[PDB]
Amino acid sequence: PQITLWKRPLVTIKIGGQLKEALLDTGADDTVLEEMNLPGRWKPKMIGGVGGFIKVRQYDQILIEICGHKAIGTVLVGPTPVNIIGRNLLTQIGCTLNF
Amino acid sequence: PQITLWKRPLVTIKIGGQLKEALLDTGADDTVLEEMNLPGRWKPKMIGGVGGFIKVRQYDQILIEICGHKAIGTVLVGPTPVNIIGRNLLTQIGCTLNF
Numbered sequence: 001p002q003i004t005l006w007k008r009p010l011v012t013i014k015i016g017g018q019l020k021e022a023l024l025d026t027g028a029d030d031t032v033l034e035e036m037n038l039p040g041r042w043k044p045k046m047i048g049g050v051g052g053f054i055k056v057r058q059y060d061q062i063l064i065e066i067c068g069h070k071a072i073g074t075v076l077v078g079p080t081p082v083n084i085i086g087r088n089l090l091t092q093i094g095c096t097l098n099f
Numbered sequence: 100p101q102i103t104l105w106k107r108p109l110v111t112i113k114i115g116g117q118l119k120e121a122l123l124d125t126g127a128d129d130t131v132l133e134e135m136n137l138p139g140r141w142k143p144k145m146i147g148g149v150g151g152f153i154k155v156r157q158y159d160q161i162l163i164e165i166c167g168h169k170a171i172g173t174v175l176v177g178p179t180p181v182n183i184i185g186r187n188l189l190t191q192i193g194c195t196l197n198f
């Protein structure tokens with residue numbers, strides 16, 4: 001599909017057997033999701049943005065379905081105000097910017 | 100153009116007669132640029148991102164050319180980690196997400 005940017009590009013995603021709304025975010029290097037109790041091993045990480053840094057948990061090889069498109073890769077989990085799909089998974093679903 | 104997302108979508112912009120590099124950021128409602136002198140009146144404002152809130156100067160109805168396309172809109176200037184072009188300007192240049 002084509003998504004215009006008049007409003008926030010929120011789409012439904014499916015992760016860990018759960019449906020969530022997440023932002024398709026070309027400005028985010030890596031996908032970061034609101035705090036959730038994923039199983040598995042993880043590694044601490046810090047990501048920086050407007051306002052400074054937050055601490056997150058980095059999970060590797062996590063399957064996310066984004067609008068029916070499957071993807072698998074790094075998912076970070078931490079106190080973000082919004083679920084964010086970053087470039088690491090956007091490439092995997094064939095997402096481009098166009099103008 | 101069509102821009103893939105294996106790398107950061109960085110583009111050259113021109114603002115205040117000056118060239119800069121900025122990030123096309125579909126996750127940003129607003130456009131925030133690093134500290135710079137811009138002519139015209141400005142109002143102090145607060146904006147929040149992943150890490151908290153920062154003080155910025157809001158410039159309204161500013162001319163800014165993004166990878167060859169002209170926009171005239173609101174630009175926030177302050178201690179952002181990188182220059183980010185948000186939806187208020189991405190819409191003006193006809194930018195969409197496609198997959």
Ligand SMILES: CC[C@H](C)CN(C[C@@H](O)[C@H](Cc1ccccc1)NC(=O)O[C@H]1CO[C@H]2OCC[C@H]21)S(=O)(=O)c1ccc(N)cc1
Pocket residue numbers: 025027028029030031032047048049050081082084086122124125126127128129130131146147148149150180181183185
């Ligand atoms: C360094 C580039 C950019 C600032 C990074 N951010 C993504 C960005 O899209 C965030 C994503 C974001 C969206 C909404 C809340 C918090 C973060 N948007 C943002 O900060 O936009 C601000 C400017 O307009 C306003 O609208 C949204 C917040 C304001 S981020 O959230 O901090 C981020 C940094 C690293 C990773 N791996 C994932 C996300």
